[PDB]
Amino acid sequence: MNTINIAKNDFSDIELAAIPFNTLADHYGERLAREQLALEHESYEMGEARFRKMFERQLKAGEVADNAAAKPLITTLLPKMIARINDWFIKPEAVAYITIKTTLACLTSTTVQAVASAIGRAIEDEARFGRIRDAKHFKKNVEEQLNKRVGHVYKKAFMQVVEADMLSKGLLHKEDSIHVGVRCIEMLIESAPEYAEAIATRAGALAGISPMFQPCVVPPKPWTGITGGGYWANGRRPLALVRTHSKKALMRYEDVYMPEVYKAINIAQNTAWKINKKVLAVANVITKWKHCPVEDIPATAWKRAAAAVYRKDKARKSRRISLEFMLEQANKFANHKAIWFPYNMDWRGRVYAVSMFNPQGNDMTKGLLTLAKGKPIGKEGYYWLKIHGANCAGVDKVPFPERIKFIEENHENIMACAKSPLENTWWAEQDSPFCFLAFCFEYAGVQHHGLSYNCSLPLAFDGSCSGIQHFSAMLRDEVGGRAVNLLPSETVQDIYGIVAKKVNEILQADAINGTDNEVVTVTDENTGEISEKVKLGTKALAGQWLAYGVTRSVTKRSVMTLAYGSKEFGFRQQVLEDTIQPAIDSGKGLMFTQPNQAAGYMAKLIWESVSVTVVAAVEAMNWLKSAAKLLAAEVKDKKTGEILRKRCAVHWVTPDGFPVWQEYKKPIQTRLNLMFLGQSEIDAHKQESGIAPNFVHSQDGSHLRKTVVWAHEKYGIESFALIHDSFGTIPADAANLFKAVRETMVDTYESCDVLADFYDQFADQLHESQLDKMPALPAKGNLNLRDILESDFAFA
Amino acid sequence: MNTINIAKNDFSDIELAAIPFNTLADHYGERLAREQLALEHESYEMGEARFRKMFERQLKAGEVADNAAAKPLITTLLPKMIARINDWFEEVKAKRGKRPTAFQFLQEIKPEAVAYITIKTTLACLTSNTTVQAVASAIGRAIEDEARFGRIRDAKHFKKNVEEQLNKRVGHVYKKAFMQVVEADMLSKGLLGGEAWSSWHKEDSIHVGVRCIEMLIESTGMVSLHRQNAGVVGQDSETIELAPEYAEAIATRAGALAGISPMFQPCVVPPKPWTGITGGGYWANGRRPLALVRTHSKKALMRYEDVYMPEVYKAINIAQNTAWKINKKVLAVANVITKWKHCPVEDIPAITAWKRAAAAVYRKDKARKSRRISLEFMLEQANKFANHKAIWFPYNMDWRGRVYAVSMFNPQGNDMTKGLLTLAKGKPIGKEGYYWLKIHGANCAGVDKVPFPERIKFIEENHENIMACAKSPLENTWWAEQDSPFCFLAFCFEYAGVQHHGLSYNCSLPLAFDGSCSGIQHFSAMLRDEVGGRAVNLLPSETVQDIYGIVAKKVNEILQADAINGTDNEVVTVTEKVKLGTKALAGQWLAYGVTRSVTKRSVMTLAYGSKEFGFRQQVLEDTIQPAIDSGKGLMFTQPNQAAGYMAKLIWESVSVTVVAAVEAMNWLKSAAKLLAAEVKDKKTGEILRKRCAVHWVTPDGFPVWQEYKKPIQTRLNLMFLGQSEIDAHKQESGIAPNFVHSQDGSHLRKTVVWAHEKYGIESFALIHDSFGTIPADAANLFKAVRETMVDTYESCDVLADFYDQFADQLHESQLDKMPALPAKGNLNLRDILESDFAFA
DNA sequence: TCGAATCGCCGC
RNA sequence: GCGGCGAU
DNA sequence: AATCGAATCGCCGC
RNA sequence: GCGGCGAU
DNA sequence: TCGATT
């Protein structure tokens, strides 16, 4: 409960070390060096404070046991107590966990009787709950709402209701409780400051390894290796080029040779940003007046809404704390001529900025940041500057000439917002408001100062659906590629609309020729009550959906979740929560007499429509999932029981050269309590669930890294705004980046059959029995990749 | 249906007529006369457009029968329909054979209700498919809906608790949805006799309406019947049209009503001095002339024509003459923040119960829209008159004599309106002006329960905050966080001016001084109550006296005593439940903590006549129910027992604190009851003394007559809206609140004339007990308002005068029932002159 | 058996 | 009249 | 048969 | 682990 | 729901 201050020695050395200073000072100046090292020391300093505040709230709460510093002693203390309870003789392990947590919590916030009463009272409460959970299928319906509850008091209150319903349907001493705790303590005594020092020492250590990362005031330290990049000073937490769950998976990158990967990261780190002072000036004012600046600009349904408004209030507090941090960071570096961001990678190869305040943030955070080195905008830069503004306004589904026309027709509004941003709220109403306001300021400058006016604003181009774009390129899918604007097109293609149009074709077919409605008797298991129930035929079901009107908004989420592995089942939950339930609360949905029947009907229709719109996407993710299932399985001779092939990790190499290992590992045994917080084999399921998204994310990351090196080497582009598939640069450089991103993607998939390369990596790993099971590669389609270079709306 | 425009000829007269023009031109010149008469013309123009939009919506919704142009004709036709209904029923019964198919359906609905349901639904159908079938269907489904759910209304005792929740819902579908839910609930309880309604089939409902349509053509004849393509089986149709004369009657009445409903605006010249009952304020001879007294009958207005009240007339004209201007600095701030927030000062960032929660969000959504529409009007009017060097507000009086401004934008409004308005004619502020300028700023911030020396201390300590708010009101939100933000911000600007320009600075800001509890103050003055007078700051006190904190103190004293002594809990059978004792109940309340918050509303409602019963509903809704929703109120295990217990304690605390108030309102209530009764000898039955109204005259010379009148008959439908003798209960309910309000009106009127004649004061901000003037004249207004109050209650015994008015009217049986005048107390009125915190 | 301040604006 | 807003 | 299940990264909270 | 928020 | 483990 007494924490040493890491600051005085461990944080002092970071600034103190001469070798970082002398190296930093020569290139960037002594004062810029000192500030960078002072800043890095401050980041570690802030992190120590953050842990101290969290620990303090945990002492008052008694949730010290939940804190990571009190975890390691409990793990060595617990097994000896469980055996002692058996030797002295609810599950034995759970009682041992309950006693340790209650003892540590009671001491944190001292009578022996009071702790014994608490342990017994919690023990009785848990067993009354545990029996319902340990029945279990009914508890599974309860468990999701139990997981949604917050705090033991709400858990017990929710537990209380489910027990009463469970009694109604029929699934079914104070001194002794104090005596139960006393004997638990008596066994615990058989199983102190020295233990308290262990949590106290660990608390210091965890305070030293969790800094609040901050932007660099000098160009970041280039990555020459696996660790030590980004920030210049030797720290307690050295940056890793790849964020790894294990130190082993970090080390497999130590040997590997990835010259192009390193260049891409170093180039991105080199990009110099500055705070957009004009946008910051606006944001500082509207923030003092509104919780969210753009949230509200003047211009049985009850029970569902009640759950949302509690969430909506909790959401509103969660948004503000993020805002107040970003704003302070924006104010703090507002005067600096330039700031930089260090970059590392996730284990799949996507590029992330390391500091908490980064160009990859929300719209306000994005609008608060701009590049520091501009070039005169010229004719083409103005053209792309206007296109970006239309995109920020939400005009992104029309051809480019209509996007320019929208800007010119709204020129006076744009000018008004630039002149008096607090007097005209039109910018706040646009889809990406603060980024739009930033565009307004530059648009005014070009009008005030002409095409020679210097512009450093980041103009971001985003691929429409990167995963489907990449999957269609791999397998040459024309129909899917056209739906994602990979092919050159007269008009912007909406994949959500195409799916919706195909759904309407099925809807019309089933309404004319459909299964008739059928009636089946149903008997409730508990009641034993026989009620006649109607299964809706496809004809009746289509009629309800046709009455509602099926738009792109019905099919939108199902297409987005496709890359994440969602399929027909997950769609039915989406349709219910997205369109069917919200219509009911609005009073619409009179046609949706049975919601779940409509959602199941719709989810089948969306899945059929998606599978014919993008065949390569669906085919590829099935092929990858089959591969992961085979490798992840352990092969055992049935008679022998010995394993012929152990569970195998899945590994591949991106065209950039980045390798990735996907090792999802599940623990052997875990303990979870209903009323108290719950306390190395490869998981085959997570291997299958993740192989399709992780592989395609690995491909988009290589595309990004290839684009930034190609843009810097073929063209002069030195400033990059990168969000995983969004590519930004200054307007003078904007047209070349648009070219470079098309040239990179065309180059790789003309050069590399990524799926065949994947097959060569695991083909030997398959057991003799497994080879017949593995599906063949999906057939290539009719698409020509050269047409991607001509496409306007691919944006990538 | 279609209404000719009033505007072209009749609104044209307002600017044309020479005598209104010349009278205005002689006082203020031709050109100000041009602007005023065109402005008054626009006020009539805006008002007519208001009627036309409402009529268009009501026509679209079929709610034309709800509109006032259609009420007179419906009142004429309704008896004819009803008589024909009753005769049809008697004629159908007399004839032998199978009864007509509508006969049974028409019977369960009252003959009055069918009559109105047909007229409204036919008028709705015709003004918004003229076929008899669709209108007969539309009638029939409405009859059934009144039949099915009416059964719930008349049963009746349960309906009284569902009546309010039905009213709180807007729109027929929501009303119908709620009634299906209660019907299912009461059927489960078996209240409705267990008879679930069997829905009428469609062919029945058609036949129900046709019999109704036929019955109006015989009796009333507004609708007439026409047959298209007779004898052709395919196209044989019958149609319905409205009688043109009846359509012309609503159209004539619609136009007549649109020309008499103006949207009153401020004056660009000083308002017309009042010389008589009518035609004051605005200068044009208008279709709706202003009245000096706003009355419900022309007769109550006519009583004022004869009366000589020179001081009443002087006070209104002085108040009208006060020159105002729009505070541009405040208006600049309000124009900005309003565009960003629905209520600009609402959410500043700073560092069964579920069913009740749902009702709260519904009300909150209503309150947001209704609040914002008022805001948008005030800002638009403010921006309109922003560039004028001065503007003026006409004034008139309610039937009790309280003074109100006439234009919709007026200084007697909310904070934002009050903040947007400042006086036009200012004087150099001076030392004394600065002092009250800071006191006013302290009160706008909410530092009002404290002596003046610390009010000055608060302002001077927050000097840098006040300065920052004035320099950048948009950059520092501290002013918006105050209790009266825009009025505080208005002080911030003048405070910044005094520091920039010194004590020579010309300040025209209205410094409002408000009596703490004007009703109890007046009642304490009449009967000379020392204890009551001290509690409401009538007598000089060491500190400001909070009557809520006083009552809370006396409540807490009982609670502590009832925690040591007092009844134990007992079990009582109820048609066995525990009845909590005062000892248990005291413990619950002490656990909650009883503050001035628990007692505030009860003291406020005292002047309105509320007593121990009304406090229990207040206590439950104000503190107990919110506590339960918040997760407090575990102590309130039985909420109604706690509320009734606390209501008793508040009533005992209040009655011993302000005795003069309780005694005086009782005496007036007893007077109105005796006067409002009819006196009839029981054996003969003849009425010896008729029901009599209540009349008195203020010391200012204002007469006032209380004649609450009850209508003989009324009608009420569940889903469609419903459409003279003295009301004795309203006479007793109203006499005491109205009498004390007539006194504060006289005090206000006597104050403005005394401040105008003894001192030089020419600018008055007046809200019924709030007295405002420029800072240079603040000290004298403080003097003047005290001097008037001491003078009247030394010169006049208002209760004794009141008794002299009605003593002759009392009957001989009633004289023993009448209480004596309440005894005067030991208070000395001259202490009011030295009372700092009376403010009045 | 019943009941338990005035004035305006907006909506129905 | 009912629903909501505001003034005292 | 029984039965389970139905993307990555970051911040805040427990 | 759970919950909430944001990025793609 | 149809695949997946079990």
Residue numbers in the entry:
A (entry chain F): 1 to 89, 109 to 128, 132 to 156, 159 to 196, 205 to 223, 247 to 354, 375 to 754, 767 to 883
B (entry chain B): 1 to 128, 131 to 156, 159 to 355, 375 to 598, 607 to 754, 767 to 883
Verbatim from the authors:
Bacteriophage T7 RNA polymerase (T7 RNAP) is widely used for synthesizing RNA molecules with synthetic modifications and unnatural base pairs (UBPs) for a variety of biotechnical and therapeutic applications. A 7-(2-thienyl)-imidazo[4,5-b]pyridine (Ds) and pyrrole 2-carbaldehyde (Pa) pair, developed by Hirao group, is a representative hydrophobic UBP that relies on shape complementarity and hydrophobic interactions, but lacks hydrogen bonding between the base pairs. Our kinetic assays revealed that T7 RNAP selectively recognizes the Ds or Pa base in the templates and preferentially incorporates their cognate unnatural base nucleotide substrate (PaTP or DsTP) over natural NTPs. To understand the structural basis of UBP transcription, we solved six T7 RNAP–UBP complex structures with or without its cognate substrates (dDs, dPa apo structures, dDs–PaTP, dPa–DsTP, dDs–ATP, dPa–ATP complex structures).
We crystallized T7 RNAP containing a site-specific dDs or dPa at the +1 position of the template strand DNA. The overall structures of UB-containing T7 RNAP elongation complexes are essentially identical to that of natural T7 RNAP. T7 RNAP is captured at the post-translocation state, where the elongation complex is waiting for incoming substrate and gating Y639 is stacking with the −1 template-strand base. Both dDs and dPa are accommodated at a binding pocket over the O-helix, essentially the same as the natural bases. Intriguingly, we observed UB-specific interactions between the unnatural base and T7 RNAP. The dDs base fits perfectly to the surface of the O-helix and appears to interact with R632 via hydrogen bonding between the sulfur atom in Ds and the carboxyl group in R632. First, in the post-translocation state (apo), the dDs or dPa template base can be easily loaded at the pocket above O-helix with similar conformation to that of natural bases.
